[PDB]
Amino acid sequence: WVTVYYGVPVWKDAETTLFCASDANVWATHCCVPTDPNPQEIHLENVTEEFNMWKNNMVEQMHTDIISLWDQSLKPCVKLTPLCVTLQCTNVTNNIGELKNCSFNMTTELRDKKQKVYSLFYRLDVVQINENKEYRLINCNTSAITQACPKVSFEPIPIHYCAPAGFAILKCKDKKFNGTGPCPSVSTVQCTHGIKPVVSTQLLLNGSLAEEEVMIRSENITNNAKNILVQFNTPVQINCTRPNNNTRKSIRIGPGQWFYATGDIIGDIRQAHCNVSKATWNETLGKVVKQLRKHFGNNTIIRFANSSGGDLEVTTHSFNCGGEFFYCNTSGLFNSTWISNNDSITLPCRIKQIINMWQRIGQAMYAPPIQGVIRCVSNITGLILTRDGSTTETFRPGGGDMRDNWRSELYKYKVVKIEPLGVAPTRCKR
Amino acid sequence: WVTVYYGVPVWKDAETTLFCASDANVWATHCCVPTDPNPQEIHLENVTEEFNMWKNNMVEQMHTDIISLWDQSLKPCVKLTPLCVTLQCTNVTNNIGELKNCSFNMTTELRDKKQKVYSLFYRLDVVQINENKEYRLINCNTSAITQACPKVSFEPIPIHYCAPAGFAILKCKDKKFNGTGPCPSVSTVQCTHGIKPVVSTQLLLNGSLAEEEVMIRSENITNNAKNILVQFNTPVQINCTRPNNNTRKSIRIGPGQWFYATGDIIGDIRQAHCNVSKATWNETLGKVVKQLRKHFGNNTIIRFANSSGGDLEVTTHSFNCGGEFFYCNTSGLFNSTWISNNDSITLPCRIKQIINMWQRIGQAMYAPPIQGVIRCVSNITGLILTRDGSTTETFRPGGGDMRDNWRSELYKYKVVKIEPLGVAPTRCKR
Amino acid sequence: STVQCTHGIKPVVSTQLLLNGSLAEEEVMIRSENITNNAKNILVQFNTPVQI
Amino acid sequence: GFLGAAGSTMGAASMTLTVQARNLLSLTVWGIKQLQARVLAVERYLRDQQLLGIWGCSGKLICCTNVPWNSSWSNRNLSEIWDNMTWLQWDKEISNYTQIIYGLLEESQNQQEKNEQDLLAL
Amino acid sequence: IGAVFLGFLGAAGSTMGAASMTLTVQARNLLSLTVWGIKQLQARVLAVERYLRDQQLLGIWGCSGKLICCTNVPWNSSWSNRNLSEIWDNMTWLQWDKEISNYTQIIYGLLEESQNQQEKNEQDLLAL
Amino acid sequence: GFLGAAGSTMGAASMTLTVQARNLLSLTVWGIKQLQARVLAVERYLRDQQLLGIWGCSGKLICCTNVPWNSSWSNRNLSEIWDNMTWLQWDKEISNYTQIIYGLLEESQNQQEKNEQDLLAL
Ligand SMILES: *[C@@H]1O[C@H](CO)[C@@H](O[C@@H]2O[C@H](CO)[C@@H](O[C@@H]3O[C@H](CO[C@H]4O[C@H](CO)[C@@H](O)[C@H](O)[C@@H]4O)[C@@H](O)[C@H](O[C@H]4O[C@H](CO)[C@@H](O)[C@H](O)[C@@H]4O)[C@@H]3O)[C@H](O)[C@H]2NC(C)=O)[C@H](O)[C@H]1NC(C)=O
Ligand SMILES: *[C@@H]1O[C@H](CO)[C@@H](O[C@@H]2O[C@H](CO)[C@@H](O[C@@H]3O[C@H](CO[C@H]4O[C@H](CO)[C@@H](O)[C@H](O)[C@@H]4O)[C@@H](O)[C@H](O[C@H]4O[C@H](CO)[C@@H](O)[C@H](O)[C@@H]4O)[C@@H]3O)[C@H](O)[C@H]2NC(C)=O)[C@H](O)[C@H]1NC(C)=O
Ligand SMILES: *[C@@H]1O[C@H](CO)[C@@H](O[C@@H]2O[C@H](CO)[C@@H](O[C@@H]3O[C@H](CO)[C@@H](O)[C@H](O)[C@@H]3O)[C@H](O)[C@H]2NC(C)=O)[C@H](O)[C@H]1NC(C)=O
Ligand SMILES: *[C@@H]1O[C@H](CO)[C@@H](O[C@@H]2O[C@H](CO)[C@@H](O[C@@H]3O[C@H](CO)[C@@H](O)[C@H](O)[C@@H]3O)[C@H](O)[C@H]2NC(C)=O)[C@H](O)[C@H]1NC(C)=O
Ligand SMILES: CC(=O)N[C@@H]1[C@@H](O)[C@H](O[C@@H]2O[C@H](CO)[C@@H](O)[C@H](O)[C@H]2NC(C)=O)[C@@H](CO)O[C@H]1O
Ligand SMILES: CC(=O)N[C@@H]1[C@@H](O)[C@H](O[C@@H]2O[C@H](CO)[C@@H](O)[C@H](O)[C@H]2NC(C)=O)[C@@H](CO)O[C@H]1O
Ligand SMILES: CC(=O)N[C@@H]1[C@@H](O)[C@H](O[C@@H]2O[C@H](CO)[C@@H](O)[C@H](O)[C@H]2NC(C)=O)[C@@H](CO)O[C@H]1O
Ligand SMILES: CC(=O)N[C@@H]1[C@@H](O)[C@H](O[C@@H]2O[C@H](CO)[C@@H](O)[C@H](O)[C@H]2NC(C)=O)[C@@H](CO)O[C@H]1O
Ligand SMILES: *[C@@H]1O[C@H](CO)[C@@H](O[C@@H]2O[C@H](CO)[C@@H](O)[C@H](O)[C@H]2NC(C)=O)[C@H](O)[C@H]1NC(C)=O
Ligand SMILES: *[C@@H]1O[C@H](CO)[C@@H](O[C@@H]2O[C@H](CO)[C@@H](O)[C@H](O)[C@H]2NC(C)=O)[C@H](O)[C@H]1NC(C)=O
Ligand SMILES: *[C@@H]1O[C@H](CO)[C@@H](O[C@@H]2O[C@H](CO)[C@@H](O)[C@H](O)[C@H]2NC(C)=O)[C@H](O)[C@H]1NC(C)=O
Ligand SMILES: *[C@@H]1O[C@H](CO)[C@@H](O[C@@H]2O[C@H](CO)[C@@H](O)[C@H](O)[C@H]2NC(C)=O)[C@H](O)[C@H]1NC(C)=O
Ligand SMILES: CC(=O)N[C@@H]1[C@@H](O)[C@H](O)[C@@H](CO)O[C@H]1O
Ligand SMILES: CC(=O)N[C@@H]1[C@@H](O)[C@H](O)[C@@H](CO)O[C@H]1O
Ligand SMILES: CC(=O)N[C@@H]1[C@@H](O)[C@H](O)[C@@H](CO)O[C@H]1O
Ligand SMILES: CC(=O)N[C@@H]1[C@@H](O)[C@H](O)[C@@H](CO)O[C@H]1O
Ligand SMILES: CC(=O)N[C@@H]1[C@@H](O)[C@H](O)[C@@H](CO)O[C@H]1O
Ligand SMILES: *[C@@H]1O[C@H](CO)[C@@H](O)[C@H](O)[C@H]1NC(C)=O
Ligand SMILES: *[C@@H]1O[C@H](CO)[C@@H](O)[C@H](O)[C@H]1NC(C)=O
Ligand SMILES: *[C@@H]1O[C@H](CO)[C@@H](O)[C@H](O)[C@H]1NC(C)=O
Ligand SMILES: *[C@@H]1O[C@H](CO)[C@@H](O)[C@H](O)[C@H]1NC(C)=O
Ligand SMILES: *[C@@H]1O[C@H](CO)[C@@H](O)[C@H](O)[C@H]1NC(C)=O
Ligand SMILES: *[C@@H]1O[C@H](CO)[C@@H](O)[C@H](O)[C@H]1NC(C)=O
Ligand SMILES: *[C@@H]1O[C@H](CO)[C@@H](O)[C@H](O)[C@H]1NC(C)=O
Ligand SMILES: *[C@@H]1O[C@H](CO)[C@@H](O)[C@H](O)[C@H]1NC(C)=O
Ligand SMILES: *[C@@H]1O[C@H](CO)[C@@H](O)[C@H](O)[C@H]1NC(C)=O
């Protein structure tokens, strides 16, 4: 009275490698599989499952892989360790110092020859040593610096993650799912939706919006050691710029070895900045507060304060756009108290060229200058907030792991393995 | 009435990766897969198939592997970028100009020491900077220069290509096949014949001969943008030399880092050259004309003119012999008008040491000096010709892709995917 | 007997003496490819440790 | 429709066995990882096939054995099992007997082959 | 006589009624020092996958272990309206494969369902 | 034990065949060796399975064929072979005939399948 069955529709939670696929240079090619233009999804009638976005290894892979490709892309590029020289430096001419005008003795195509080279630098990449004054590049005591190849794009082109044979991705259709626990409505796919590998700190600028209501998710909410992720159900328009018409020049420093230097600035010298719709932002916070109160009390006062101190990478909002790395003050966005019962916010931004991209030591990337003027428009889709921790609950914007920027898209997906072989009692015998 | 059959003798054209094989250091230690001492060749009775030598992926694979192997072979070798310095330079010692006597201040095993060294150079590798005179190595402004390891040979030892499981190669036995279309007599092999990975430009120096008649093949003929590949039905004997007894010396430039420099010349200084049997050459051109006329008219006058201008790789006949790179002036071979109704030709040859082996930018190989006197003997088996484009049809020799030197052996082979599963109606039912 | 795996072996580097391997079970063992042929080495395994 | 039967009861679900079975076989960075994935998928496939071979169920999606249900593995009525449970619930229900049942299937097949050899030699 | 063995593809130019005698010859040949050898590992793996897909289908259709199997699926005529006296005697397998290539998926789908019905019925009988 | 039957006589050992069969397939540099080993184990496994398929012994550890023993291969009595020899000794005893026996098995299976088709066509 036993029958063995094969093709049995069961699975177990499992961890495997997912592969990228894309909608058919830029880092985003590198042999990703052209994806399915008409992907299928199977609704699973009467199927529920437990999900946990905080234990989601799909996030772990996204993190791991982005870093690996980032590093791979710099392998063929010209090194800037030859620039660890003493520089003589002054300020860039303007009427009354964000930019530095520095000069040095550089190598040439011949090892026995020298040339005088001067260029413009952001002060944030330069350190004074001789307490013109003498300066060095701020990373020469710690890392090798590699120039990114100017021909390679880092644009966050969306990719899809697909399961290997023997695996499937289960996904939630529960619009109220909070990233954890039982998910009442489950379906399955071979591939996820396309996700843009956007790298940011305080704000999420190019992700998905909540289906209905602002969703606030956390590993705990009550645990002050954890982050709270806020997903907007509406975009907020943010317009960022680098309002300086720049030129670039190349220096031949060796045999086919080129260094890209800022030439000069055409016209006025102005600070980088971002414009956030003011009305939209206030309406957005009002919605966030209404939802935050669900865990703090209906008449609890919610305050938005600015960030804590530390490095710009953890105190400011940052992003890569137009090839430049922007650091924005953002305090103008978190300066209000919400108590129960057209215009814009202008945020100054700073720019840096030597980037410790993955918060690692010894591997620095140098962003070559971008010519012309940069204009970027993004969708604020969400925020990373922490509790500043008695009738007022104060939150501050802050940074977090890169993984938190991606679990925000992957929270609806889980990977399981298929186990088609099994048995059951029957009335038959051979 | 459906019956399913497995082991059905059918196939589809398919692109796959072939592997190399070898019959008992570049090429020489590339043992690949040992070959079959007595390979089987299966004639396909009643079977015809279409071939296209101009679209043959096997050619693309030889390119892919040959280029890769040469790059890999330089990986562990000493770099010559340390030699990119200014040189003081004069003549050598001769009465009455290709060679130069140049000197420079080189590094030694210690960073605190320098040495005065000098060596002989060929004009083609050295350029004046101070428009004794000051010079630099000609490629130091744009590319890395790597010394080939002196212990490594590049002799074009023939290798075989073989299909992987699930694939097989179809081969033509058609002595008159012109490279495209139906091939009335075929057989199947797992492996191709051994092919010498020879690199050349204007002349094809060591391939197979046509079985009966000189074969002229082209992707189009009519379209003057295409090359014409001429396969002789008899070899032409060519004898090349670098008739200078040269010596070599090593220079220690760093810790286990050695540079190989030309020392001096014993005896007379003479030009490199090639000797082509005159009588044979005239006979082969006459044969080529008789066959060329099939596309131009029976009484059409055919003229052989010399090459067009450009780099030596496209204006001269080049080859690697003894490790030296020869650039021979073949204009002495193409001086004839053929109108319907013992001796030798000596071609001077130039010598170079810094070679852009695959005509790429940034990767230059330095051929270390070869001691002694070089003698090369080869079988010219064919030509690469183009139409100089109304009663006279003029042809000129010229260069082309390295791929064209390989399709010259590969035109007889095609690879297909075996597809053993299929169905047919019968009179049986379970 | 049949095993899938060997005992743990220390990847130790030494010349004249082997200072952390296995001891012989009962008696000092002397092994050589040949003994008679002086071109071969003699490997001596102790049945007791000697401390250094 | 690969997991379409996932929420179905066992007696409804075991009709799509083919649908799932037919979908099981389907540079540096992004170089080696995909090769590893293919190899591991192959090993999983083969282990299941070897067991079906060992138990005498090769070539089938549904096969009966001559092993009785021993009751203690599950005392549920077969009408409860096939009509009011899904395969996922069921697999969990008896997961700790997997190795017992498999060992019995193996021994039974060995006895059957031995007896057939004796009969063919008779 | 004539030592007829033909070879691996063998008489690929022969008709189907002659060619389907060497099925085993082909089947037996389908499975057949430092770095960058990944190219061969990739080739080995792909050969394995091709083999397994074919074997799985023979399994699903109930033709596992056979080079030739009869099924109980009808020929539907529109696929090919040639007589068997024309198909087996005046056509090669290569010509045939092309002749009915557009129905590959039709026949295969029908084969899967027939086997599904056959196994269902066997279980009902063994449960009797 | 996996090779526990290794010293057993053939008539004793050919009962443990499943014990041996079930154990046959079982981040950086060198991961290629590991992958290679897995691939090779698969290839070995498949070649054996293919031959059993070809000979009509698929799914069995023991199969009788319709091919006669031709004596010259071994003139020992079956009782000598099964009771006084181990499989390892036997494997050596008839090593050189492997290709003959297999060629006969392959031919026989083809004839059997041909005859089955003729009967199903009747
Ligand atoms: C959040 O998501 C938004 C929307 O997807 C991103 O914004 C877009 O980012 C891309 C990439 O930077 C921007 O595209 C850039 O446009 C520059 C100007 O193009 C003009 O001319 C073309 C001609 O057809 C017009 O179509 C176009 O509208 C403009 O008029 C290009 O110069 C950029 O690169 C190209 O030129 C350079 C020159 O050297 C080359 O080196 C490059 O390889 C390439 O050829 C690029 O195309 C796009 O405009 C942005 N849109 C908006 C609304 O901003 C956000 O950036 C993203 N947020 C973050 C932080 O990334
Ligand atoms: C077309 O096909 C022809 C025929 O195969 C090729 O011509 C042959 O090319 C090879 C390689 O260039 C020639 O081989 C070389 O011969 C030299 C002289 O050999 C004689 O003298 C030495 C002195 O010690 C004797 O040992 C030897 O037995 C002979 O008596 C060798 O010196 C060359 O190098 C060898 O020694 C050095 C020493 O350090 C090693 O490093 C080398 O690896 C190698 O061992 C080499 O052997 C061969 O002679 C040519 N044949 C003819 C008839 O000339 C054509 O090159 C080919 N054409 C093309 C375009 O590929
Ligand atoms: C500081 O920034 C300036 C540019 O903003 C750097 O370049 C200097 O620019 C001035 C003005 O163009 C150059 O002066 C030139 O002098 C000649 C003298 O006859 C005159 O004919 C030209 O019209 C012009 O006035 C100056 O030479 C130029 N410097 C160099 C090295 O090219 C300046 O170098 C920057 N300083 C540092 C330390 O980086
Ligand atoms: C140009 O080529 C010559 C060799 O062809 C290079 O070497 C120089 O050769 C001359 C003649 O052999 C050397 O002069 C001799 O030196 C000995 C030393 O005791 C002396 O006794 C002789 O009377 C005679 O003077 C000369 O020194 C030698 N030079 C070196 C540096 O070795 C010459 O260097 C080459 N020049 C360049 C720029 O490459
Ligand atoms: C769902 C969950 O497990 N949440 C955890 C909290 O329960 C846990 O709460 C802490 O429990 C301690 C027990 O003595 C209390 O003293 C402590 O005040 C309390 N803190 C909070 C914020 O509730 C917190 C922190 O340990 O972690 C959550 O994960
Ligand atoms: C193209 C060329 O000149 N090759 C050289 C040969 O010419 C040369 O001469 C050969 O000498 C032999 C001695 O009897 C003759 O039998 C042979 O026919 C003759 N070859 C030719 C083509 O005439 C040989 C040296 O023996 O060296 C070749 O490189
Ligand atoms: C299907 C099955 O029986 N699986 C076994 C599990 O039930 C078993 O879990 C343990 O069951 C005991 C029964 O009283 C519980 O007391 C015990 O707490 C429980 N253990 C856990 C971790 O939940 C496990 C472990 O013994 O083995 C499975 O095979
Ligand atoms: C026996 C058999 O299956 N014959 C097939 C025909 O039935 C089929 O045509 C049928 O046409 C109808 C027109 O509305 C369709 O609704 C019907 O579904 C279609 N039948 C099938 C099975 O698809 C023709 C079409 O080429 O092929 C015959 O083989
Ligand atoms: C970012 O720039 C865009 C482009 O100029 C702004 O969108 C425009 O806003 C004006 C306001 O009246 C509209 O009339 C235009 O039609 C809008 N352009 C488009 C293409 O829709 C956008 O508002 C800016 N965002 C911020 C925060 O300033
Ligand atoms: C190729 O085609 C020829 C002609 O159809 C075949 O030759 C016939 O083969 C059959 C046996 O299969 C003989 O009975 C006929 O007498 C042959 N006819 C002629 C005119 O030769 C041939 O067998 C086919 N296959 C091959 C040759 O491989
Ligand atoms: C080329 O130069 C070499 C030396 O670099 C010559 O070698 C000579 O060989 C004879 C043979 O007995 C020796 O006695 C000489 O001493 C060698 N010379 C030296 C400097 O040691 C070689 O003969 C020359 N070859 C040609 C063709 O001229
Ligand atoms: C090949 O050799 C010929 C012959 O020497 C070179 O061309 C000659 O250049 C001189 C210079 O005035 C002329 O007088 C001759 O009439 C030219 N001869 C011919 C045939 O044109 C030719 O440039 C050399 N080509 C290469 C590539 O080196
Ligand atoms: C290009 C350049 O700046 N070179 C300066 C040189 O002019 C100066 O004389 C020396 C110290 O006096 O320091 C070098 O770096
Ligand atoms: C080039 C550079 O910035 N070096 C910094 C130094 O300025 C800084 O003071 C120190 C810690 O304070 O860490 C070094 O790496
Ligand atoms: C999707 C969802 O709401 N999940 C959990 C819920 O299961 C849990 O009960 C609650 C605290 O008890 O915290 C929510 O996040
Ligand atoms: C071989 C050579 O170039 N040597 C010169 C040396 O003669 C000169 O004296 C010195 C500077 O004075 O520079 C060295 O490079
Ligand atoms: C092998 C051969 O001769 N191939 C083609 C032939 O098929 C074609 O018809 C002709 C022009 O039409 O050009 C030939 O090269
Ligand atoms: C920002 O916060 C400071 C804190 O005192 C407050 O004074 C300031 O007015 C706030 N900004 C705006 C725009 O109100
Ligand atoms: C920068 O100035 C140059 C001057 O020719 C001009 O061509 C270019 O368009 C300017 N770029 C911008 C963004 O204004
Ligand atoms: C914001 O999201 C909407 C959704 O449709 C999209 O159309 C819009 O272009 C996005 N804007 C930006 C700046 O990404
Ligand atoms: C070689 O001699 C000629 C004779 O005029 C001279 O012009 C040339 O510059 C000399 N070469 C060098 C490197 O001096
Ligand atoms: C062709 O022959 C003539 C005869 O004088 C000669 O002058 C001319 O240079 C030759 N051309 C070539 C290319 O050898
Ligand atoms: C030229 O072809 C003949 C044909 O036998 C061969 O013997 C001779 O060695 C060949 N010459 C070269 C250099 O390969
Ligand atoms: C090594 O030192 C320890 C310390 O107690 C001692 O007991 C032991 O005998 C010493 N070994 C030798 C070889 O001296
Ligand atoms: C889901 O439960 C309902 C309850 O009646 C049932 O009718 C339906 O068929 C169930 N779906 C599945 C997949 O079993
Ligand atoms: C070894 O030989 C003895 C002799 O009787 C036998 O009893 C024992 O079972 C044998 N062992 C094996 C593995 O057959």
Short mmCIF file of C-alpha atoms in Angstrom, two decimals, chain B residues 68-127:
data_model
loop_
_atom_site.label_atom_id
_atom_site.label_comp_id
_atom_site.label_asym_id
_atom_site.label_seq_id
_atom_site.Cartn_x
_atom_site.Cartn_y
_atom_site.Cartn_z
CA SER B 68 44.97 34.36 -26.77
CA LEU B 69 47.93 32.02 -26.71
CA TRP B 70 50.35 34.64 -27.81
CA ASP B 71 49.15 37.02 -25.14
CA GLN B 72 49.36 34.33 -22.51
CA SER B 73 52.90 33.48 -23.55
CA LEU B 74 54.10 36.95 -22.57
CA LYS B 75 52.45 36.98 -19.19
CA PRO B 76 55.54 35.86 -17.16
CA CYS B 77 58.07 37.76 -19.23
CA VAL B 78 60.20 40.81 -18.38
CA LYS B 79 58.71 44.18 -19.27
CA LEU B 80 60.72 46.68 -21.28
CA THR B 81 58.90 49.76 -20.18
CA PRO B 82 62.04 50.52 -18.01
CA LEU B 83 63.87 51.14 -21.32
CA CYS B 84 61.60 54.03 -22.28
CA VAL B 85 64.31 56.66 -21.93
CA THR B 86 66.11 59.06 -24.20
CA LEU B 87 68.94 57.54 -26.17
CA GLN B 88 71.96 59.24 -27.64
CA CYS B 89 72.50 57.84 -31.05
CA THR B 90 74.90 57.57 -33.97
CA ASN B 91 75.71 55.28 -36.93
CA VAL B 92 77.26 51.87 -36.45
CA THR B 93 80.45 51.11 -38.43
CA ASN B 94 80.03 50.87 -42.11
CA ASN B 95 81.09 52.64 -45.21
CA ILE B 96 78.64 55.03 -46.86
CA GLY B 97 71.74 52.86 -42.98
CA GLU B 98 69.10 50.68 -41.35
CA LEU B 99 71.09 50.08 -38.20
CA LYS B 100 71.68 52.50 -35.41
CA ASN B 101 74.16 52.56 -32.51
CA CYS B 102 72.38 54.02 -29.54
CA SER B 103 73.21 54.44 -25.83
CA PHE B 104 71.41 55.14 -22.60
CA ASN B 105 71.52 55.23 -18.80
CA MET B 106 69.84 52.04 -17.55
CA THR B 107 68.79 50.74 -14.12
CA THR B 108 70.62 47.89 -12.43
CA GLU B 109 69.77 45.39 -9.70
CA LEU B 110 69.88 48.23 -7.16
CA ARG B 111 67.71 51.32 -7.24
CA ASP B 112 70.72 53.40 -6.26
CA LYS B 113 72.83 52.38 -9.21
CA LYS B 114 72.77 53.21 -12.88
CA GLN B 115 74.72 51.86 -15.81
CA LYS B 116 75.73 53.03 -19.22
CA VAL B 117 74.63 50.54 -21.76
CA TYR B 118 74.22 50.52 -25.44
CA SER B 119 72.94 48.33 -28.19
CA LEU B 120 72.19 48.09 -31.84
CA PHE B 121 68.76 48.96 -33.12
CA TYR B 122 66.85 48.90 -36.33
CA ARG B 123 65.65 52.25 -37.66
CA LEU B 124 62.06 51.12 -37.78
CA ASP B 125 61.92 50.75 -33.99
CA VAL B 126 63.57 54.10 -33.14
CA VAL B 127 62.31 57.66 -33.57
#
